[PDB]
């Protein structure tokens, strides 16, 4: 019972696909969907994907509208496909996954995750949906989220935040912190101890600890002496150096957040996608100090404190591997005369 | 219940829309409709209309596949819209009429021709469809075709030929000669006595009389002598004059057909549509003689001879009006010393 | 290095992709690839596929330009992908297969057929290429073609014809008849005894036997007489019945070819793709006889005669299965009084 | 006042741009120009150029509709632009020149060829247009064509053929053979003695000498015997060798013409543009013999015989330079034991 | 390597074109460039120019990322083309210049500025690049920028600001104030004494003098009294009249910037491009006062005061010419009773 006119009826009446009966007249012009509302055409969807307009429209309408893991987490866990749902990637304005299982005729590789083709793929399961926990139990490769405990399975506590309709939030009325479980080649895996990125933005930044509040308030000198971290190069790494043409350091989001409020700047997101580490072309509107590739991570300041604190401070050049969002991130631990010169995410 | 996927299912399985239940996966890219057949995309329709691709696709699938009047006839009779069908214009690769009645949700102005909006429009009715003759009786404005007599209605015998899937033909296995009836403001009109164009092509030209057979096989001199056409300027009008840079006469299709077998030429159809009189930009390959606007009509040679021989040849110039395909066609008749100089469809 | 400009250089200089170095300036406008030749733009390729224009262009340039199996054969044998080549499908003006192996960065699922992902896929291997016979021997699933005998394996003699740049031909200067080998789950299969379709066209129809020559010159009667096919309903099945509004029989290409010489007709290829049995919407220009779905097969007349003469005519209706192009084709055989009434490819 | 609606009015009424006053309603959808005729949209122009649709439409409407030099001639003479006209390239379906002079606001570089910007460009003039001969006299760089003699100027007799609305022909009702004149940096230049290509087609080939008539009628052996061409490898060069997988010779159009009538083949024009030497990807339907880049020239057989018989047969390999269509064409001459092995247009 | 895939590799890895080796898979759909990153397509560039998508992409990647003159400065100086770089026009999201020199194969008119074609063009040269000062010395027509003195050349001090990645700024860590040099027909020109527009925005308007701090904080009456501007019509010219249906005056940005803080309004930029004087369709949200064409200039208030105080107030109407951004701006000065009535940029 799948139809373009039925999908559009659901968008018009329910705000998304809700499996209701009915049809509305539709027009497809360029990469845009229109419907008629009292003699005039109303745009329902503009295709920004590489998929045909009508398939992209159906996938978008059938997106999961409950709090779901951020696609950065699903990419880091090597998630290939979702079971009987669509994870919409709001950063790319596209579905997170290429193919589907029991969602859309044009993209389905199967109707059920139990099919042969699905076995080598890491299938995403949502324990909030009836029978999905059991499907995970029968799956060869998969990743599972639950709100509560599951019989005989040790959980991994996930990030506090999840995405709800493109809004990353820590739910108060709804649950966003999930238990994570993973299977590889039929065997349940132990997920590693990890830090999580905080997924905040520049324009409306929110501190999530006293140290973060203190960072945003206290001056450079006062903060460094208060939380005691003299030789860890916070002046360069976190605060940033704008004295030269080539902008120095500034690899922590909170640092960008502090600079933004006093003096704004331009961030060019030349690779627009959700990732644990982001690369931007930054131009400071105040000094004219710029950097083409500025790698930025949003870690809780306390976590970054703990991370920098915990290192060697010996070898002139080094690589440190930290577990962030279940994946391993490399950092260039440069050193000279026994103190931190810089610390930043690895590029080449 | 209209659906793009159901329309496509009918096209794939039945060759056109046949009201069967079922769905196929469809992709819309550019102005092209594709369907998935054994994992690969197969083109079903390329939109050549000014309507949205999906709308054009549905109208094309729902086209009338029985012998129907040629578009030029419907246009000449002032038909604005069809009752519960689509007349596909194969010359324009588009629907003959802008709007529909009980066909498609995007183009319907009504579900039934009895609706108020239809009253000022000349609705085309097909007597071969149950109840359409009665709908014509109730219609304020309309045109009706039937295969047989209708109670109380005087008929007009139409052309021998009709269009079947874009093929103009004189039916032997099927009926193509219809009775025509017309109503204006509730009053049945007397259709005029008319000649009909023969709707033939240059490549597969077929004579339809002994005189036409004689025209194609005999030489210019003998034909003119045999049929006593001496002062009627057929040398110019029909045979054409290729001696000067501007091509002279050549306004009868049979004349173009005769020339074509001898030496080919180019015909630029700069207004591509069905019309009683066609205008072409002609270039003769052998001589280089050309004409920007060469008006061409396909009349049975016998009819053209009857027309020209019915004229008074006493005036230098005069406008001659002839009813053809139910419309009044104006010709320019130029005479000198009691003989014809030229005779051509008037363009000014 | 794989580059759009290098691919275009190869096309301009060599007609296709070869592996020579160089670059030409390229413009991509709409779905068209252009190159600058002496200050003006020259169209090199128009994308008619569902793939991005530049991707389709690279795949087309990298097409196999040696005689290759026709797509219908590969499809019937269950070929999913080709090893280190592109089988272009000239019926769809698109690549025959979705993905590639060592061809193009955008479509490659592997660089080598030995990779894990390839194991469940039936890979096409060309014995004329060094090491491909051995790759087939190591492959789990596959289809191999050779010009000569393969040590140990009983060959299956393929069709006499193959495709060379979209030209289906029986090679005299080149080999077009291949030996076929097939492997399923590591085990070599015995290919069935099969008939092959002749892959001819209506316009340039060439008889391939004396019977076919006689069919085309002799009259229906004289031909039925000569070959004694009185109770085999050739009048209906092969010649076709144009006496009613719906076209009777006409399921053999040679039949269509015979009628075409006499009187032309329209064939609407509503599913444009290579298939053993083709379905057309046919309209006879002379009679007006038509049929929405007319299933047409191009069998050598001698083979069709052998097929029909091999059947039992004791039952009113029965399903007849014939191996054609390595696939099982179902026919509907209708009898009455020990003679054939009709025989046609089954669809319902 | 130049306008889109006026350009279209002129096309609908005159078949091209004729400077008549008036307007018609226009729609621009995709790369297509439509006009409304009795409530329905009629396609007037489909843009196949790299210019904007409306610009291409105006240039096409304003194309020269009198016999003009073929594009290959203009290109060989180094023509960069036209004076107050548009030379339409029917081979590319685009204007022959990028920029214009007193034609179109969007493409104009000047209103008059006397403007400074035009001085280094070789601007084309037409002596058939009032004042153009004098403009050429004031021009720094230019190419002039005339029907007759010009005061105090030596003429170069051009090819017998010219292009008229995309039809290459030898005029009988019109003059196609022009006198050619050049000026480079203000000085009138003596055009070289040259051969001219005949610009004929495969499907409608016409011999233009007794030797050409003899070539088409006589068998290979007796033609070579009659014209004493024994050691000139005509069997290879002209007739072509179809015995091997790679196509042997076949570099003369007349040779292709002779083969085609006997047995057809396919010619892929992978660089679609007008040039003295054309490159095609050829596949012989009978044998399967093919060649990726088969360079073809249409020389009068008598001219080709004169060329080949004028060569010294003493060296194994040598470059032969021939002036054709005012340009120097390089050929490769291979000899053995005092007889020619092969001869062909050089590419690498 | 000059390739689409290499350009895209550079963008993904370096944030722009950096001449590094490598390739990334690219897809071109519509006017959008995508790359495959971990199995999913990521948008890198959307073409908003009139150039082909791939050309525009290369041109954008190869943009100058160092502080450069604003486009309006370059246009005012008559710059036609830039030497071995691309000046990206961020106002139009397109290259500032049509053609290039040693940048891109599709747009290059030369590889070096020393080529003949470049001689009549005013080439932009950047003294910060090795050898460009010398190239200017050899150039016929050019414009040069330097950070310091150039021996033998008298400089013109340019604006304090420059554009860095679309950000106009006064550099503190980088130099944004350049020395300007110009030459026509081989002779070095003396650039005129000029005022410069301050290139500010309404949103984040920053005063650059005490008079400007005051304009923004004091009330209209207090400000005019403090700076003794009584008969200079500042109420009309710099504050604007919102009492009538048509907006009065408001031709200074600071004025718009002062209103905006109080009450917002709409500015329709119907000619979106960089220009010394901008025209907007302004609608005041509070009053409903509007003006279709409101000419706005960003002069430092002190400069505007100096300009208006330098005028003779004896004539009713008068044209006032002021050199701004190296160009002559015409103003329309209206006086009555020895006081200013209005003063505005003249449009005709």
Residue numbers in the entry:
A (entry chain F), B (entry chain A), C (entry chain D), D (entry chain E), E (entry chain C): -1 to 346
The authors write:
The oligomerization is mostly driven by the contacts of the N-terminal (ND) and the middle (MD) domains, while the C-terminal domain (CD) carries the canonical catalytic residues from the endonuclease family. In terms of substrate specificity, NendoU of the coronaviruses is described to cleave a great variety of single- and double-stranded RNAs in an Mn2+-dependent reaction, by hydrolyzing the 3′ end of pyrimidines, with a strong preference for uracil, and to release 2′,3′-cyclic phosphate and 5′-hydroxyl ends as products.
However, the most drastic similar effect was obtained when we added the DNA oligo(dT)30 to the samples in Bis-Tris at pH 6.0 and in PBS at pH 6.0, where we saw the immediate formation of 2D crystals of NendoU in the frozen grid, which somehow had induced the same pattern of arrangement of particle in all directions. Due to that, we tried to use this condition to obtain a crystal structure of NendoU. More in situ studies are required to confirm the existence of these molecular entities inside infected cells.
